[PDB]
């Protein structure tokens, strides 16, 4: 299994650049193969537009990841095959992403000016 816990410093798990498989031949008590708890700055797992990760066995656990949107978690379920036809994943609705507004609105640039050394924007 892979467990990320109290890793205050991490904003992403992308440093695991080549990780494609978690077998779950051994699991964290409660039968978890991927477990994320109390990671105060975690905003990204992997970039699911590029990364593929497979989880053979076990469940997911997500609690107290305030900057991590449930969309990222839901994308992970899809990608990893921790498929919604099967059994549960203890995923908190209230403690994942609660301190993040996720992308929502779009700001557009009204003005752009170049100089060889400068850029002025509005």
């Amino acid at each position: 299994y892979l467990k990320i816990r109290r890793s205050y410093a991490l904003v992403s798990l992308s440093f695991f650049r080549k990780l494609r498989l978690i077998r779950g031949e051994t699991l964290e008590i409660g039968n978890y193969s991927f477990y994320a708890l109390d990671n105060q700055n975690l905003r990204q797992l992997w970039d699911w537009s590029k990364h593929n990760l497979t989880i053979t066995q076990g469940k997911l656990f997500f609690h107290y990841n305030p900057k991590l949107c449930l969309s990222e978690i839901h994308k992970m379920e899809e990608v990893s095959g921790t498929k919604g036809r099967q059994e549960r994943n203890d995923i908190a609705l209230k403690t994942n992403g609660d301190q993040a507004s996720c992308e929502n609105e779009l700001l557009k640039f009204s003005y752009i000016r170049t100089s060889f050394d400068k850029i002025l924007l509005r």
Partner: antibody, heavy 109, light 107 residues
Framework: VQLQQSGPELVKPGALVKISCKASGYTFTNYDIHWVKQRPGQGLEWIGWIYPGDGSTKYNEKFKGKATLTADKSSSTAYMHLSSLTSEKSAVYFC??????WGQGTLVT | DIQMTQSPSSLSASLGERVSLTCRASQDIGGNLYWLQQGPDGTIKRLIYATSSLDSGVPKRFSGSRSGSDYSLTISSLESEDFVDYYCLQYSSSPWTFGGGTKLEIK
């Protein structure tokens, strides 16, 4: 916010003429003043800009030796001098604060 | 220099009609286009910034949109004051360039 331009400007050929653009209602120093030329019955050409803070400018190659851009931060007024005028006929020149707000126009004959 | 091709150069329409003017960019300009309106007195006013964003005070009958390299200005229901001149301008690249203009005339 007001860019209040100068002219009527009647000038003899081979002379030089200086057209002003007094800015008000905002911090002069924070924005660019762009100048645009309109040859009647026709479109708009971008001349170039000035950054009143630095006095830095960029011109359109077409207008490089012709136009000269200047700002007087003490009065928050920007200027454009045209040089060696000949059979230009007439044209209307506009300054604008980064395009959102334009001045009324100045006719040079 | 990016060339902005404005069409039609002139348009006849009546009060309450919906009309569209187009600017085609010779290079991709992303969303960096303004729509300008010029009054018969010469006063220039910006109506749209960043292709689709309406400036404060501009009547909601004005809209901007993009499809491929075609940037359009649409007046959903013409009023008598709208029968003036319109110009697109690209600010995506160093030489700022303008469309050739559209004169909107009463049918």
């Amino acid at each position: 916010v007001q860019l209040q331009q100068s002219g009527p400007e009647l000038v003899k050929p081979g002379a030089l003429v200086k057209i002003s653009c007094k800015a008000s209602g905002y911090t002069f120093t924070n924005y660019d003043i762009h100048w645009v030329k309109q040859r009647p019955g026709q479109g708009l050409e971008w001349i170039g800009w000035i950054y009143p803070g630095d006095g830095s400018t960029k011109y359109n190659e077409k207008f490089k030796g012709k136009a000269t851009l200047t700002a007087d931060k003490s009065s928050s007024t920007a200027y454009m001098h045209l040089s060696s005028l000949t059979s230009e006929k007439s044209a209307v020149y506009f300054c604008a604060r980064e395009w959102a707000y334009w001045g009324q126009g100045t006719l040079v004959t | 220099d990016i060339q902005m091709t404005q069409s039609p150069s002139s348009l006849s329409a009546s009060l309450g009609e919906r009309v569209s003017l187009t600017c085609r960019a010779s290079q991709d300009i992303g969303g960096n286009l303004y729509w300008l309106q010029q009054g018969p007195d010469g006063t220039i006013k910006r109506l749209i910034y960043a292709t689709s964003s309406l400036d404060s005070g501009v009547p909601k009958r004005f809209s901007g949109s993009r499809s491929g390299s075609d940037y359009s200005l649409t007046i959903s229901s013409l009023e008598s004051e709208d029968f003036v001149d319109y110009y697109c301008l690209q600010y995506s690249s160093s030489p700022w360039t303008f469309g050739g203009g559209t004169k909107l005339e009463i049918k």
